[PDB]
Design a protein around this ligand. Structure first.
Ligand code: NO4
Ligand code: MG
Lengths: 231, 792, 159
């Protein structure tokens, strides 16, 4: 007979990153509800990242400063739009996808999930409802959400959603909108026979509000004590 | 139910091959299990007439004969058939014949006598004869036609399996109506002729029950019970799976297969006074027509008289009223019995007759009057007798009601999903037997026929439309729903549990939920397992109180087949039934079982294979628990089937969620299991939800300190660790044991433990004063609580 | 309001899922790391001195200028980060992208392939009373990689 309370001889369980946990939590809402996860390359060209999103070229929606680039027509992703573009150009509606993945900007690496839904008919009313219960069931609260009008060249009408986090403050969590007709028409989808909406949320924004983190630099310093807190 | 196709052709001849006919029945809801010819195929066998017979050749007991099969110069053939009259006409296989089994008789010579075929085949033709040598009974002579056409041996028997909702199809008339509806034909039923009454004999009406709303009885005097059963009626019953008996039983079995109305004939001389259709007396005795004597109940309807009982109503007749070879006058019964008054009662006594299953299901209540005329016509034609009047005992108000059902085009379009023509809906229903009246403009008022018991709501009529129109005409669509994101909390999913246990080297087993009660008693001698009432075997009779009672036989299965190492895990329902006063107190807990025998890792060149110890098994259970963020304290388990010194109880918040440890070594020898490691965990405890909370990390270096205690071996290291963490305060953030020693230098009964103390500061850098103050505080309380000696 | 859709069972072939890979590697004792897709060119040349690194035109710093040809160029700094903070044992695994720009004559010849990396420093098991802490050998590490390949029904040969 031996002392039964001595620690066992084995291996300590590993750790899943909190950014990937939040990413899996947001995607599973759409995964088991009809949407399919889609991924693509992180080094993109100019057409699939700008010209195909109803951006003429030298439009003010370029901002060549805060976008990492190599040549003049090859850059790092500012958003996972290329996967949504290629899905529309090859496949035909109905389209129900969510596009996670890391993107880059000069400030530098962060993840964001961008869903896309194109069917025979949708509306601004359905976009607001799907986003509301997405925010309600993610944070597991009865949130007070605010829809503000904003601008995106690929959406009209376009909106930005906030939640009353912290102490009565309004914090932006995701942008959305109804897919612009030129974005559907440029990919081979008749904007008169098919409607569509889209959205985009920063994963690091959701992860910090969900786990109470205040310095997102810890997400990529990868301190083993920090990662262990999510195990 | 097996029926002859040619008998079905006499009612409906669709002029299509047998394959498409069976395809129509299967696609109509009547799954044909088999369609085969009456006899196995064979080529070349005509009919001949035997002329002369000579005996005593080649000693023994043979006879050479000559048969005229229409040939100009017929040849001979020897045979040893013991018959009566010589010179019979019998089908004969030719020389180039191909009897079943490659029995091509190559003529030759039977010791000199030249042969040309075989003029026999009592069993070689697939006929079921009693006495040998009865090849083709001399009933008549088809004058040399092929044997496949005289007895209709190329006919097909259709083995139809019909569902209980279609009780009308348990007869030739019910199947022919189905074949006539699908092919838009009209069934030409055989013209039935009623028998006129010449005598005026007795009668009896009895309304002592509600399960016989229509009874018809006919007294027929001076019948020939020993009459000859014709070949057409014998074969029609034979290839329908019904045996031959007397002439009266064959007729009642014939009308049962033809129309679907069961009948029964009694021995009028053995009926005393009036006949009664009543409920049996409590525990009333009766000897059926078979040697079985049954004891009835007061809910089984029977047909009795003024003293005794004659038969069970619509199930089986009795021996006291059976028509024997001394029977002269008979009483023919033709009644409709309510299906609710016959269902189940036949299975009580192990009985399932053709009259039983048809009365339990729906039988045409407008048919008793028709089957009475059918039997009386066949009885007079085939046996003859003095026929009396028809006794009608009818309670017309309690017949199965068939009120009108309303059906609209919108209901048929909604349920089917596609539009069927209103001309199709009316035509299909009206030929199935319904009287549909076009109410209003687009709706219908359809009444169900008297023979169908499955039409009550409008959906029943919609099923009939899809049946006749064809299930291959169902248009393809997809259901629609709203995209709603369901509530979900972060948890340890069952799939991620399997991936962890499989990564730890365990194979998922799935054993039976019931196991042997003796093995269940071996594990826990104080167990009260839930026992099945009708288990298929003794080793599968007790619902497993633990998954070991079913996994151990699977381990022994592999161990007995040259398997040194077998590791299982199952998910995993056990049945807690102890300390329960009723079966509603049963607890069905989904659990995670672990069974491991043999070495930890497979045999390799790194080390010699040795079985695990307790800490190898605990290290695997600790990781399964850690994979679900489960905080656990361990304590000694007291389960009977466990080694009391190496078995833990897994507690969370003080309550147990499972155990881990090796089997009791005595049980290992009784089961021949070497050394086994078992564990069980509640899934609700392992597959639990979790929530992560972020805490700040210090930006300044920590301090590492060592303490070496010499303490008695009878104090658990958890209590030592818990005491150090409490007295250490908030500065001490973590501690862990890293060395034990029980060798030379320590007295017996004590051990030297070495703990590691990690001191952390949230804001500043630790000074040597506050650390030594905590170190001295921890060593002092350890010397006071346990009387130990410390070092650094 | 809510969007409506036709429920149609999508095509799916049985495979080793990404969520099942994370569980297997985590059971082997590895923590998931997410390092920057761009790393320092000096470390990129320290690992492979004959590397042709894809370098940025406007890098945010000198240590974040070259897209990683291997996940090690971005995981090694994180391993050193913990070591510079009293961490004897650190076991990482990352499921990101590496950028193969070797023998490429233009930018469209870039191959962005997703990779699974493993970095291990320290003892195989945490410090306990069972054994003195000792680092892994080749067969401790091969036994872990073999199980990852075995978890996906991958038949391999070693050279
Ligand atoms: C949308 C896109 C652009 C990618 N970003 C998603 C987003 C949408 C609305 C607001 C913010 C972010 C790809 C083609 C189809 C329509
Ligand atoms: Mg029906």
């Amino acid at each position: 007979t031996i002392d039964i309370t001595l620690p066992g001889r084995g291996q300590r369980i590993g750790t899943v990153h909190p950014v990937t946990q939040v990413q899996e939590r947001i995607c599973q809402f759409f995964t088991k509800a009809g949407f399919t996860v889609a991924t693509g390359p992180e080094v993109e060209d100019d057409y699939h990242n700008f010209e195909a999103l109803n951006i003429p070229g030298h439009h003010p929606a370029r901002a060549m400063h805060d976008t990492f680039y190599f040549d003049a027509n090859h850059l790092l992703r500012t958003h996972t739009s290329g996967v949504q573009i290629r899905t529309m150009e090859t496949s035909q509606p109905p389209i129900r996808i969510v596009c996670p993945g890391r993107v880059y900007r000069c400030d530098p690496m962060f993840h964001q999930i961008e869903g896309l839904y194109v069917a025979e008919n949708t509306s601004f009313a359905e976009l607001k409802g799907l986003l509301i219960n997405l925010l309600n069931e993610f944070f597991e609260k009865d949130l007070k959400v605010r829809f503000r009008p904003s601008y995106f060249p690929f959406t009209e009408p376009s909106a930005e959603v906030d939640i009353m986090d912290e102490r009565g403050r309004w914090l932006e969590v995701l942008g959305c909108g109804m897919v612009h007709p030129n974005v559907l028409r440029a990919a081979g989808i008749d904007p008169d026979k098919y409607k569509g909406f889209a959205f985009g949320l920063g994963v690091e924004r959701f992860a910090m509000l969900r786990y109470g983190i205040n310095d997102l630099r810890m997400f990529y310093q990868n301190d083993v004590r920090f990662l262990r807190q999510f195990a | 139910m097996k029926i002859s196709e040619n008998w079905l052709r006499t009612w409906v001849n669709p002029a299509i091959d047998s394959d498409t006919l069976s395809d129509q029945l299967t696609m109509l809801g009547l799954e044909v299990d088999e369609l085969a010819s009456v006899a196995k195929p064979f080529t070349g066998v005509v009919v001949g007439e035997v002329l002369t017979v000579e005996q005593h050749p080649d000693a023994d007991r043979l006879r050479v004969t000559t048969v005229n099969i229409g040939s100009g110069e017929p040849l001979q053939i020897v045979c040893g058939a013991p018959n009566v009259r010589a010179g019979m006409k019998a089908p004969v296989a030719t020389i180039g014949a191909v009897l079943p089994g490659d029995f091509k008789i190559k003529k030759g010579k039977l010791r000199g006598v030249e042969s040309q075929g075989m003029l026999c085949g009592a069993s070689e033709i697939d006929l079921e004869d009693k006495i040998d040598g009865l090849l083709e009974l001399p009933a008549d002579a088809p004058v040399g036609v092929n044997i496949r056409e005289y007895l209709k041996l190329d006919d097909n028997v259709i083995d139809i399996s019909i569902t209980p909702n279609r009780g009308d199809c348990f007869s030739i008339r019910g199947i022919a109506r189905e074949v006539a509806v699908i092919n838009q034909l009209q069934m030409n039923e055989p013209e039935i002729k009623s028998v006129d009454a010449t005598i005026t004999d007795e009668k009896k009406v009895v309304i002592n029950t509600d399960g016989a709303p229509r009874y018809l009885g006919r007294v027929i005097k001076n019948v020939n019970v020993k009459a000859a059963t014709p070949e057409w009626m014998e074969q029609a019953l034979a290839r329908s799976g019904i045996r031959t008996h007397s002439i009266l039983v064959d007729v009642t079995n014939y009308v049962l297969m033809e129309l679907g109305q069961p009948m029964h004939a009694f021995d009028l001389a053995k009926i005393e006074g009036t006949v009664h259709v009543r409920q049996a007396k409590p525990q009333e005795k009766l000897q059926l027509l078979n040697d079985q004597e049954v004891e009835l109940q007061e809910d089984v309807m029977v047909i009795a008289d003024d003293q005794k009982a004659l038969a069970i109503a619509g199930i089986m007749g009795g021996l006291a009223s059976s028509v024997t070879d001394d029977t002269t006058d008979i009483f023919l019964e033709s009644a409709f019995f309510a299906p609710l008054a016959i269902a189940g009662r036949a299975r009580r006594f192990g009985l399932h007759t053709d009259s039983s299953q048809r009365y339990e299901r729906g039988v045409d209540f407008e048919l008793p009057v028709i089957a009475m005329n059918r039997a009386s016509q066949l009885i007079q034609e085939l046996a003859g007798g003095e026929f009396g009047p028809i006794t009608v005992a009818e309670k017309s108000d309690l017949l199965p009601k068939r009120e009108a059902i309303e059906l609209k085009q919108a209901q048929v379009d909604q349920l089917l999903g596609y539009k069927v023509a209103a001309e199709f809906i009316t035509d299909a229903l009206t030929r199935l037997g319904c009287e549909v009246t076009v109410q209003a403009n687009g709706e219908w008022s359809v009444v169900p026929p008297s023979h169908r018991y499955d039409m009550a709501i409008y959906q029943d009529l919609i099923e009939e439309v899809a049946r006749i129109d064809g299930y291959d005409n169902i248009q393809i669509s997809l259901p629609s729903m709203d995209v709603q994101l369901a509530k979900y909390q972060d948890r340890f999913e069952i799939a991620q549990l399997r991936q962890t246990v499989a990564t730890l080297g365990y194979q998922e087993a799935i054993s039976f939920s019931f196991a042997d009660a003796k093995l269940e008693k071996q594990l826990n001698p104080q167990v009260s397992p839930l026992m099945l009432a009708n288990p298929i075997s003794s080793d599968l009779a007790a619902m497993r109180s633990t998954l070991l009672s079913s996994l151990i036989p699977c381990v022994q299965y592999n161990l007995n087949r040259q398997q040194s190492r077998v590791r299982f895990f199952e998910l995993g329902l056990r049945f807690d039934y102890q300390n329960a006063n009723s079966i509603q107190d049963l607890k069905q807990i989904p659990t995670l079982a672990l069974v491991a025998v043999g070495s930890r890792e497979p045999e390799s060149w790194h080390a010699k294979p040795q079985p695990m110890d307790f800490f190898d098994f605990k290290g695997e259970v600790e990781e399964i628990l850690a994979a679900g963020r489960v905080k656990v304290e361990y304590v000694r388990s007291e389960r009977p089937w466990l080694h009391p010194g190496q078995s833990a109880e897994i507690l969370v918040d003080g309550q147990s969620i499972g155990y881990l440890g090796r089997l009791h070594p005595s049980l290992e020898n009784e089961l021949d299991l070497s050394t086994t490691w078992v564990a069980e965990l509640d899934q609700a405890a392992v597959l639990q939800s979790y929530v992560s909370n972020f805490t700040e990390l210090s930006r300044f270096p920590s301090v590492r300190r060592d303490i070496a205690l010499l303490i008695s071996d009878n104090i658990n290291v958890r209590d030592i660790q818990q005491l150090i963490e409490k007295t250490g305060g908030e500065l001490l953030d973590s501690t862990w044991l890293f060395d034990v020693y029980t060798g030379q230098g320590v007295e017996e009964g004590k051990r030297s433990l070495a703990f590691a103390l990690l001191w952390q500061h949230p804001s500043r850098t630790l000074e040597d004063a506050e650390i030594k103050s905590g170190m001295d505080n921890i060593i002092q309380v350890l010397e006071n609580t346990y009387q130990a000696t410390l070092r650094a």
